[PDB]
A paper describes a structure:
αHBs are oligomers of 5 or more α-helical peptides that assemble into coiled-coil structures with central solvent-accessible channels. We targeted two properties of αHBs: oligomeric state, which directly affects the internal diameter of the channel; and the identities of channel-facing residues, which fine tune this dimension and introduce different chemistries. The αHBs are loaded with an environment sensitive dye (in this case, 1,6-diphenyl-1,3,5-hexatriene, DPH) that binds within the channels and fluoresces. Accordingly, challenging the array with analytes leads to differential displacement of the dye across the array to give a fluorescent fingerprint.
Therefore, we kept e = Ala in most designs and made g = Ala, Asn, Gln, Glu, Ile or Ser to sample oligomer states of 5–8 and internal diameters of ≈5–10 Å27,34. Despite the requirements for aliphatic residues at a and d, up to 40% of these can be changed to other side chains without compromising barrel integrity. We introduced mutations at one or two of these sites to generate four groups of αHB: Group I had entirely hydrophobic interiors, but with different sizes and shapes of channel; Groups II and III had polar uncharged or polar charged residues, respectively, at specific points along the channel; and Group IV had aromatic residues installed in their channels. Finally, one third of the designs were crystallized and yielded 12 X-ray crystal structures, all of which were open αHBs with fully accessible channels.
Residue numbers in the entry:
A (entry chain B), B (entry chain A), C (entry chain B), D (entry chain A), E (entry chain B), F (entry chain A): 1 to 29
The structure:
């Protein structure tokens, strides 16, 4: 459903957010 | 409908959050 | 519905988060 | 009911996230 | 329900995110 | 089912976000 599809997109963006925060952590180190 | 539309907006804002975090990461690099 | 109303509030806060991260990026630059 | 209550709590935490990011931005400024 | 249980976990993680951002703000100060 | 599974993935990514923010906080400390 349309709900599920949007939640999938939300998950995708959160994965990218996680990735960028890992990059930030690495840079600060 | 309405729930899907709000989830779409949530996904849009998360995409912008991901973008800004990438900018921050790039600046630290 | 009540679900939709809370999702709308969630979207609002995510927009503010996006805005503040843009401000942070600008400050680091 | 219960879904609305959890979304309300999600909105509350996102508001706190927005607040803390504003604090970080203000500190960088 | 299963939806409610996952939203509860989402709220929990957002609370931790809020806490860590407060810690970050305190450290920058 | 499918909505629960996507919310589970959303919770998983938020847990990773919380973890990375803790790393950032620890680095600032």
């Amino acid at each position: 459903g349309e709900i599920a599809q949007q939640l999938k997109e939300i998950a995708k963006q959160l994965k990218e957010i996680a990735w960028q925060l890992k990059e930030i952590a690495q840079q600060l180190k």
